[PDB]
């Protein structure tokens, strides 16, 4: 049988170790202290796991995917650092600890966040071994598309610019969740599938798989964040029904692969569904 909880803890331990190693304290000390304060606070490391699992799934190894796995966590980390700022969500705590700008000031939090964003690209470009340059460059491109104006940032921008609304329907809600959540998960799976040497069809299946758990990292999450939403547009009646169809379509994409190789993602997806945080 596949021990998913043991698998997750082991990946999270390797990722934490590599993250601590990639971002060391050095001058200017407060900029690096701030980066580490939010990057090394632990957590599930779902994006790094998605990247590593997608790479291993198609035949590559963890060490090849590790810089990219750390990069997507670096992006994820700074997007929360920026999301917590007074001009954005204005949160004083996260994970039960003071938010980055509350510990370091807003000026450091903004720059340490920008530092993590730039360093994500630097680290994947310079530290990735076991993949030819054209492939590393293709991956840098995919990372860029998944976090920019057609990915993570677009979701955030459309979301903050759509606060004073009331006509928000399924299309609007899908755009936001697909961009501010799914886009970086899709990017995480794609960098790994490509770095692992995956064929285009494998990349395509994994890209769709990620989009599905992306939206799912939400639909259920409402029934995880609430208790504009979906149960507001359809009620927990066909809400918990939507997530069940999203999980199924996710798992359907994984049918392309041998089931033994697919177990980590089949499970990273049942968790991602059935999770309370």
């Amino acid at each position: 049988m596949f021990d998913f909880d043991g698998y997750m803890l082991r990946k999270a331990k390797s990722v934490n170790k590599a993250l601590e190693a990639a971002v060391q304290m050095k001058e200017p000390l407060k900029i690096h202290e701030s980066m580490r304060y939010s990057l090394l606070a632990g957590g599930k490391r779902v994006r790094p796991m998605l990247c590593i699992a997608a790479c291993e799934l198609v035949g590559g190894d963890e060490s090849t995917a590790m810089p990219a796995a750390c990069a997507v966590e670096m992006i994820h980390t700074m997007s929360l650092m920026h999301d917590d700022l007074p001009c954005m969500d204005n949160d004083d705590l996260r994970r039960g600890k003071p938010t980055n700008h509350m510990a370091f000031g807003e000026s450091v939090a903004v720059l340490a966040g920008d530092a993590l964003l730039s360093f994500a690209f630097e680290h994947v470009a310079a530290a990735t071994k076991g993949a030819p340059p054209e492939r590393i460059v293709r991956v840098l491109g995919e990372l860029a598309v998944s976090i920019g104006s057609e990915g993570l940032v677009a979701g955030q921008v459309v979301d903050v610019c759509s606060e004073g609304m009331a006509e928000v329907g399924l299309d609007h809600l899908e755009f936001i969740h697909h961009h501010k959540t799914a886009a970086l998960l899709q990017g995480s799976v794609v960098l790994g599938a490509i770095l692992g040497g995956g064929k285009e069809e494998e990349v395509a299946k994994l890209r769709k798989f990620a989009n599905c758990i992306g939206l799912l990292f939400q639909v259920v999450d409402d029934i995880l964040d609430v208790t504009t939403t979906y149960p507001k547009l359809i009620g927990v009646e066909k809400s918990k029904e939507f997530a069940d169809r999203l999980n199924r379509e996710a798992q359907e994409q994984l049918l392309h692969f041998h089931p033994h190789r697919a177990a980590p993602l089949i499970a990273l997806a049942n968790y991602i569904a059935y999770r309370d945080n």
Binding site: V110, A112, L117, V137, L140, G141, G148, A154
Partner: protein
């Protein structure tokens, strides 16, 4: 500014405009386009096309990189002027206009930086053997220059500057980190993308470092009037010294970026 540098700047501007087409959702693309052109022009970006041409490549192969460099600079410029709420940084006497609110500006800078890497990754030419390796090297140079030990270190240290109380040595260091490393990055990338050897790359890099530092000093001489000719002359000398060994039409121009050629205009005014 000189005709040559102005025509190169326009080319970069036309390339960025063709690359950023305002489209739905305009809540994302409107500010993305606006903030890209609202940031000051940077010679770090023109220096990339120029350096490419100086070593004989075609400036067209350095365009994606010149664009990326401007984009990284622009996002930093937007973030540098965000109205923060906690007084964690001085509110530099010069307040600039803001069409969009802090949140949108903050986010847009975050979208602009990756766009530069997107342009670079997507500019790989299949019929070009060495493209991947060169574009990969240039992505590394740019991400480092816009990173924690590059431009961000300069921005961070700039916050410690206190009007008419900060030494020229300190201001010169801030300028080296905030502007010189980026200018050094552009010249080096332009050399790399134009086929230069490690020899010409390192010299053009040092050149951009000194010219960029001097450019930053000139722009800070408007808030700390003490801009001694010593510093200017020191950097200018340091820069020109790196250009010895390039001779010709192209090298003449490059050289002028640091030292303006003798012109009747100047003299006539003083007249």
């Amino acid at each position: 500014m000189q005709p040559y540098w102005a025509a190169i700047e326009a080319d970069i501007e036309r390339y960025l405009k063709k690359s950023i087409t305002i489209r739905p959702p305009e809540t994302v693309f409107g500010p993305m386009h606006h903030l890209t052109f609202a940031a000051p022009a940077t010679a770090a970006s023109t220096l990339c096309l120029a350096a490419c041409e100086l070593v004989g490549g075609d400036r067209s192969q350095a365009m994606a990189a010149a664009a990326a460099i401007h984009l990284v600079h622009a996002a930093a410029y937007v973030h540098e002027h965000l109205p923060l709420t906690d007084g964690s940084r001085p509110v530099s006497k010069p307040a600039i206009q803001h069409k969009y609110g802090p949140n949108v500006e903050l986010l847009t800078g975050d979208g602009i930086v990756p766009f530069g890497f997107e342009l670079l990754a997507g500019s790989v030419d299949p019929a070009r053997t060495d493209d991947p390796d060169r574009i990969l090297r240039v992505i590394i140079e740019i991400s480092r220059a816009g990173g924690p030990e590059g431009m961000i270190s300069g921005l961070h240290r700039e916050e410690e500057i206190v009007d008419g109380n900060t030494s020229l040595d300190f201001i010169e260091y801030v300028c080296k980190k905030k502007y010189g490393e980026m200018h050094a990055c552009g010249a080096a990338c332009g050399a790399i993308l134009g086929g230069a050897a490690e020899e010409e790359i390192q010299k053009l890099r040092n050149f951009g470092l000194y010219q960029g530092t001097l450019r930053g000093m000139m722009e800070m001489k408007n808030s700390h009037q003490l801009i001694d000719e010593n510093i200017i002359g020191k950097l200018k000398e340091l820069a020109l010294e790196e250009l010895g060994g390039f001779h010709g039409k192209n090298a003449e121009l490059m050289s002028s970026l640091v030292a303006e050629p003798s012109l009747y205009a100047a003299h006539h005014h003083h007249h």
